[PDB]
């Protein structure tokens, strides 16, 4: 049980941890499928 | 009708152009599908 809490006071220091991670956004691009889209339209009309 | 025997000679070889161009769209179309293939959703990061 000491063991558990320990390592469950590790875990909440790791959940700290990821919160601060998660604090850098890192936001996907908004128009990755249009950018595929796009290159999609741009490698058939090369093909044409 | 040496004209004639000549021209449906012509006209031989034109279905077997038509053939080889039926030929050639299927394989265009083979192309087209193979690059629609290349550019598709990858579902493969819940898998990761």
């Known amino acids: ?48 | 009708e040496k004209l004639s025997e000549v021209r449906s000679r012509l006209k031989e070889i034109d279905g077997r152009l038509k053939s080889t161009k039926n030929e050639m769209r299927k394989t265009n179309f083979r192309m087209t599908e193979l690059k629609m293939n290349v550019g598709k959703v990858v579902d493969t990061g819940i898998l990761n």
Do not use: C, M, W, Y
């Open chain 1, 1 to 48: 049980t000491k063991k558990l809490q320990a390592t469950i006071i590790s875990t909440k220091e790791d959940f700290l941890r990821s919160q601060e991670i998660l604090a850098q956004t890192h936001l996907p691009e908004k128009s990755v499928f249009e950018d595929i889209d796009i290159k999609r339209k741009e490698i058939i009309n090369k093909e044409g």
